[PDB]
């Protein structure tokens, strides 16, 4: 009967049922194998640790985040994932429900076959099917015309859809925030002499990329009051002891996401991006996708957004014209909140991917 | 530790329930809210319309408020506790030794409510709570023992370094404190378990034997108790009931083996039922589950999920064990990998849960605590923890080795005392089937009747039994 | 049947069975020669005493410790003391058990090697195993986390270990405490015009070593109540009938393990290699190094440690980093109570070095 939404982050793996609260478990879905000897002859260690308890054991494993730049390492460390969500949070068999799984918006043939085929083989599963995270974003805010953005560590994507078709020749897909911004804020926290440089660690520098940074008004004016001999800085304490006071390092890194020529390739700034991806729709279309700029994704919780990206925006797109941008609460579980509301639903109880059928066709049922 | 909506023995009710304002002044009793073991399960008195009206107002706990006295037709714990006292001055006992028989039961209670909370840091240890202080000076009079010697022996490890060359002496070492909290209740396991047997070789002199030869009993013991969720103490009944099961179909074949050639209708054979499998699971050297189990309160730490994985590390073959989520009853699909297991009986599959598993088990009477109950300051008490009349066993303290002493294995060694008892005598089995769930009168259930022929042993029996005769 | 505890002490060779009380037999280590010509033909002499009786006929023979900085002198004493231990003292055959043997955790690669092989050819046991002294010291206060000190005459150690990790990169040796403060009280004992030289008397200078002295709070201020008439002088009574009277000398002689400064030699003291180990350890880990200091050995029985260790760390730790120092009852047995719970338990009841094994593979078994 109840259909099962398990949403596969590139952060932060989310599993919840259909319907109609919030996910029941979401965790930092890296892999920890024990990396030094060991003396104490009790002693009952497995062979990878998951998150939550690859969280609560940190400095003696070795971190591998099973998704890197939007697609999956390995299948071997994959199943153990899976395994670990269906059995010790969610605590349900996955032959008792048709599940519904999500993938990334153009992401590489075929990943998304080998996932389908391995998934079906290995947990016997009734029926399924993947759907893009960013499309069920349109779902969370009810729209029937907008662009859609699932924005995680560290993979962003750009989609405009009209009522009630999407067009595939406007999509864009970066792989530029947020895992980037990661690595980013660890090399300016070491331009301030905290030097971080191991696995575990660099959880650390996203718990503050989660709370203490954020995103200025306009970088050059708020650039200028930081040098300043006035107070920026705000005080972390961290899990040794140590004490870090940082000023604009803080505001430097979530600006980061405008102007990628701070890393230095060749694509532009979320600004840019967005903007030619509605010069690439149909032209009646255009002035409907004004004031359906709705933002998504975890990695958009910088309180900096969207009055930032707004005030971008207004300036660059065609005079006259009202565009409003769309940022409420609940973004990192838009998606979710997305794929909530489907599974629910008739007609698309008829959607699904059937057992039978995919005897018979194999895992060439792409189309 | 009491499991949930389930009571304690039920002297711990009828002496709460029962006692008057002459009684309760002698023994300084309160309502079951108050201790620690009563409050873990129920606190419900069962009674009639009657003595319903009689349960004092200060014998009354907030769930006694809220749900009242529990309706049994035959229980009455606030009645029962009258005619109990006229079955006392039946028996053999006198009225100033029934008091002494009083003074041994409050003294458990007014021990289930110490707490110990971790020192300042002062060279480690333990320290008792703040809230505990004349909660172990209304103890120690009723066990017999002095205040400011007691608090030394509950949290200290008493030992000597005297046993060769320099100068020999005492020293002490404190416990941690979940060791005290062990060690609390392993004297509570202790002293009503030597009151029990106080009153049970009390009875046996009140009609004593002449002589001694040979003997016909009757055994009776609890059946296969199997419930919604089962416990650690389903446990030991369930491998208890599957050993009693072990000799029952050896006595069954034995019988047709003499029978059908002592009446000569020729000669035959049958493929036994087999349980060895099913025992060496339960209780086998080394890589039995309850071979785990004694050996797992030893380790530095104790832990239940570090107890489960290990079921399935040693026990990763044997049919009769799977885990807890392939269960063929939907309601035990619930349970994680580290949470349970089930094993399969005479009876059938029955799934265990492992949370609060381990913490029911480990008790541990160490020296400072076992050689100052026996030394106890009041002297009916003294006579309870032997040296007894006959058979005295007179063991010193002066000696050294073994500390905390095997608990997991107590129930196994005990029952085996019995078994090899059973093996050596003949057996006469009643199997005793209840009809319908309310003790009514002409009434039959085959929605009752039908699970009790499947849960003791008789459908055994009947798949053994394939004669033709 | 039941394995046999006996461990090669740096002091003090303490033996007694797996469990559960305490050793058996204690003794410090030392053999003795008849150092003057004999004038009674009784004579009933033997060529060599161990102690105890070496400590009953001090003043005439002249007392070796087999075991000096940290290592067995040679194996020609070594093997008689080994003989007198397991044979006049446990009376028990070594033929009749597996063995348990303590080492140092850091000590001359390959004498392990070679104590293991000659120990299997001098008293051919059935199966061994050798054990460093300073992780048995967790089991003997069930500890799970924590920095782990064996300190005796001569050799001190600090090793961190993290549930049940031991870290490598952290293990730090000291060979400073106690023989070098038992040479130290004979060094400022001469200060106060009483004279010891020779070699059975140095017993009766670590004999006061062990019940007179203690450790300050605040040093700079008992050097101040000392220079007046206010008395620390305690009393003692001499072997020969001669009264010694000490007063500042009584605090000198321990407060030496603290800055090495006294000897003039380049080390740190316990105060500041306590902390150099715990930051020799990964970021996350020291969060549980600081309340898991666990003390131990012999040379910690100073009735004046550790809440002068806890006042100086609490000092140089970060501010507000909460720091209990556990030091328990017992610490002479630490070790020995250590071992007795692991070769006691399953599962490494199966995991000795056994004889078949041992004869194929010869002593690099070791590691
Ligand atoms: N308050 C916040 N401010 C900035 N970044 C945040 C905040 N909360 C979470 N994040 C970032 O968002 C990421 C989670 O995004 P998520 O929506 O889970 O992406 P996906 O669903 O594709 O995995 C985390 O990696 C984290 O770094
Ligand atoms: N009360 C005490 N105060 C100070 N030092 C002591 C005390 N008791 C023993 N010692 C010292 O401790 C040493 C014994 O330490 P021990 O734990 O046996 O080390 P090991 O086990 O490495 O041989 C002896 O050499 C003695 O000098
Ligand atoms: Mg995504
Ligand atoms: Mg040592």
Redesign the interface.
Known sequence: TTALVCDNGSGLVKAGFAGDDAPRAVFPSIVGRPRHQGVMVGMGQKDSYVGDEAQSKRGILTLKYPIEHGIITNWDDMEKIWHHTFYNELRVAPEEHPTLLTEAPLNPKANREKMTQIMFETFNVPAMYVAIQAVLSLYASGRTTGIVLDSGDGVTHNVPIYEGYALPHAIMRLDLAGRDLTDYLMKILTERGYSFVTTAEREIVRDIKEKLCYVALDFENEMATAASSSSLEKSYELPDGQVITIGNERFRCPETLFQPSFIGMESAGIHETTYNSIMKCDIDIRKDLYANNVMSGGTTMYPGIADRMQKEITALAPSTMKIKIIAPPERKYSVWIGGSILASLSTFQQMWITKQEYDEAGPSIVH | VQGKEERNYHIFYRLCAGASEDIRERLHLSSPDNFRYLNRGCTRYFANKETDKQILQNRKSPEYLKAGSLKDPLLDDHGDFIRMCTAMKKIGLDDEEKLDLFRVVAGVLHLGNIDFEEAG?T???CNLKNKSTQALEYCAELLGLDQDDLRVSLTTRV???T????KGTV????L?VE?ANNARDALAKTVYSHLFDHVVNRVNQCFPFETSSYFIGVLDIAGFEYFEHNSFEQFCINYCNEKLQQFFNERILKEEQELYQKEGLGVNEVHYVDNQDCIDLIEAR?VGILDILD?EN????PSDQ?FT??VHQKHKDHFRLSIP?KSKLAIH?????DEGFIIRHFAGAVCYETTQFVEKNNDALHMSLESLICESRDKFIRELFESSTNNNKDTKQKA?????ISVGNKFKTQLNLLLDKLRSTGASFIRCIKPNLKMTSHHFEGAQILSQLQCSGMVSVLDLMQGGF
């Open positions: 840091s060279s480690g240890g030992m000597l370094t046993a060769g060359g320099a020293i002490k070492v404190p941690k060791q080394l050996e030893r380790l530095p730490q570090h994985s290990a989520r699909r619930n349970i994680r990998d050294g080795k073994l500390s905390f």
